[PDB]
């Protein structure tokens, strides 16, 4: 399935020139990439300060690397919006695992129930699913990873105390309060020999889960909707929590850090924001804030077009005598636009005309169409440039020549030329010489499940702790 | 992405025997599958008789391999039902080449236009891309292959008498024509330097292409909506053409043949009907054609569970007090249907429960759902079980022991699995004492482009030898 030539020698020198416009406002620079990597590991170190910053790094307390070599069976849940998966997960201490999984929808009348509606729901879906798979009961208490991807601060692993609710949940009750002990005293009265051991959010467990089967993992990160990244830092390295931590957890432990950099640079200093990024922040939900997410999530690609679209639409460049109605309301063009345009493999653009046709009710013109596959491999271009920032941040901050970067996410897994893109723009801002992409020192990889496998191995480090006598948080609780 | 462990445990007996008469029904044995090539390969020797088969066998009429050192630039023309291709095809003499594509919607209106309509439009495009890749001309006409994938006869390969119309198109005055010279006069009257050299059937460009690049290639085949093979014999075994062949081409020359299979089995001797497969047959635009087609297209496979299920629910084993409305009417389950329910990850399949929930209004059990998952299993393996016979006779005629099949269409590309059971079926034949899918004599591979990189690849052979003064048909025309 080849790449198209792409010739411009039929485009009117009119639009030759806007489109040359737009490669200066699109393209970031091997230099200017260098110094958002400089500010991001300052940012990242304000971050790990008492003072506090604006990237929350938050402490995951996993505060060792899995070894590979772990064995036994675990229970791993994880929450999305619509729905849970309940994940049993047999760790085979050969960097391998078997997994048995169940998923249930959650009844879309309890995302605006109660907290004993919630935690009982969950409780029901875990002991039907106990009862298939140890029909006769278990010897021991099964350890379970709980994924809880929602804005939540930990004093100790085996707690999560929830800041805000996010993704259209609205019960009451929980805000402010530890989720965990609200799910565990649900789960006694069933009676169910389950123990939740472990809180985790899913980028800690795509860290943790693919260095269990990939020693080389130094980075797990989510380019999907949401943007996310996650490492192992060292606890001599965290300001803030100096004369907190036990004895027993020293200077040389690791521990596992939830970036949560979404908000990079909220107060835009060095991310190269247009002026259809500013409309598109102060039209959000919550203007001011995710800075470096809408920047680079894949949420924000169809509507960055939209507007520069419309923008050329009354410059009277472009859609001459057309009905724009379906291009002025916001949100018309999800990612899957930039997507089918860049995965267009005809030199007259068909599959672009048949989308602006179909969907949108415009005729476009093959010089137009042209127009529009360049601005889609611009913005997602600038997307995968501004992510890899991150991914070198990390890097350079913790001194990783080489690294396996774990990814997930729809972007990453689904967005044509991805991978292609992040791996040429690593090599920019490195200056590697090298011919391949299979032999670059710092490359992304394909990671493992997260939320399932991720918090179950996540429970497993938690359990060898607990039943030592070893400390899992601050001191004191 | 796992496979589930499918636990049957929770299963009533009455279902329990309900599914083990339906593996009763849908399995193919190893014997019984050898039974069906033995009978195949006495259809494919009375294709090529002067009597007649059910199987057409037509002669494609390439009478050469290609070396895979062939160069030059050459045009294919790709004729669907919704729209053309035009391909520009570069030969770079390493088993390699570039390719240049647009594609045309056809006009809807052009489906019931005439004959003039048609190729004036074809020839309206052809020109269009012509000036675009050669705004200053040629030094010599480019030769084009015509991808026509219709039934229709040729007795030399710059022609195509077309015996009847298929996929919706409508047009009088073609049929029973041949469409070349009316193709041909279209161009001249726009005064185009190209010129029709083939035209070919899909599955024969299928092997010829795949052919260039892979030079273990023995065969051709098509499991898409439709059902196809081709593959290389030798003139002496073609009984229906001898007295009818130019003295340049002799005894030894290899002959390419368009089986057009489908119909294999239209007197039901051999293939395993179930009373499932009758009332589609019955039920058919055309009962009592393309057995063989029925058996094995992936048109069918949602079809079939359709009526299975049906029949289990007036046999009151499952829906009991459910809303059947929806699954009454016929074809409401495509490919799709099997597809992602052999695709579903889940023990208690909720993707499923998901899929008939949301698309046919049925609330289904877990126990229901398990035997709703081993019917799509079954089904989908039968297909494919039924399919590699076809590969197995063309192979066994030929003496091919080791063989590369190119395989395309929409089965082969997306049904979840299909690869695993064609390679496991091929097994199941052969014997093979082997370990390995990939270390198999006779293995599946993904085809080259048959339309259109095949259709140049078969317009270069055939100016080969129209220029040196050589025949490519039947003496006198």
């Known amino acids: 399935p080849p790449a198209r030539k792409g010739s411009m020698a039929d485009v009117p020198a009119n639009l030759m020139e806007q489109i040359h416009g737009l490669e200066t406002l699109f393209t970031v620079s091997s230099e200017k990439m260098r110094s958002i990597v400089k500010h991001f590991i300052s940012e990242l170190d304000k971050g790990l300060s008492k003072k506090g910053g604006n990237i929350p790094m938050i402490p995951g307390w996993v505060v060792e690397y899995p070894t590979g070599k772990e064995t036994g069976d675990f229970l791993a849940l994880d929450l999305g919006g619509t729905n849970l998966r309940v994940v049993l997960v047999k760790l085979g201490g050969n960097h391998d695992f078997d997994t048995t999984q169940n998923k249930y929808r959650l009844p879309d009348h309890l995302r605006t129930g109660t ?8 409780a029901k879906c875990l002991k039907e699913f106990v009862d298939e798979w140890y029909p006769d009961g278990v010897s021991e208490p099964l350890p379970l990873g709980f994924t809880f991807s ?15 609710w996010t993704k259209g949940f609205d019960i009451e009750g929980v805000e402010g309060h530890d989720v965990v002990p609200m799910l565990q005293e649900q789960i006694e009265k069933l009676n169910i020999p389950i123990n939740v051991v472990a809180l985790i959010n899913d980028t800690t467990g795509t860290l943790v889960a693919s260095l269990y089967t990939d020693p080389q993992t130094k980075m797990g990160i989510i380019i999907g909707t949401g943007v996310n990244g996650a490492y192992y830092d060292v606890v001599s390295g965290i300001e803030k929590l ?22 990079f640079d909220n107060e835009h200093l060095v991310l190269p924001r247009t002026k259809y990024d500013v409309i598109i922040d102060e039209e959000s939900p919550r203007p001011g804030q995710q800075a470096f997410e809408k920047m680079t999530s894949g949420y924000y690609l169809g509507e960055i077009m939209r507007l520069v679209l419309l923008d050329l639409y009354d410059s009277g460049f472009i859609f001459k005598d057309q009905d724009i109605s379906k291009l002025k309301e916001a949100y018309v063009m999800d990612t899957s636009y930039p997507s089918k345009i860049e995965d267009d493999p005809f030199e007259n653009l068909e599959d672009t005309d048949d989308l602006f046709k179909t969907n949108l009710n415009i ?19 600038r997307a995968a440039r501004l992510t890899v920032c991150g991914v070198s941040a990390i890097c350079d901050k913790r001194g990783y020549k080489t690294a396996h ?8 897994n689904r967005y044509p030329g991805y991978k292609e893109k992040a791996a040429q723009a690593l090599k920019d801002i490195y200056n590697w010489d090298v011919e391949k992409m299979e032999d670059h020192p710092i490359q992304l990889v394909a990671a493992e499940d997260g939320s399932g496998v991720g918090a179950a ?21």
Chains 1, 2 share one sequence.
């Open 457 to 477: 191995i996540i429970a497993c480090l938690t359990q060898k702790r607990l039943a030592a006598g070893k400390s899992v948080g601050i001191k004191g609780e």
């Open 363 to 381: 005729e476009t013109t093959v010089v137009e169409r042209k127009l529009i596959r360049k601005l889609a491999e611009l913005v997602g271009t």
């Open 150 to 164: 929602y804005p939540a601060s930990q004093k100790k692993i085996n707690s999560g105390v929830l800041q805000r």
């Open 115 to 122: 907290s004993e509606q919630l935690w009982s729901f969950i």
């Open 242 to 263: 100096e004369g907190l931590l036990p004895e027993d957890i020293g200077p040389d432990s690791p521990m596992a850090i939830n970036c949560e950099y979404g908000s």
């Open 405 to 412: 970067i774990a990814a997930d996410g729809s972007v990453f």
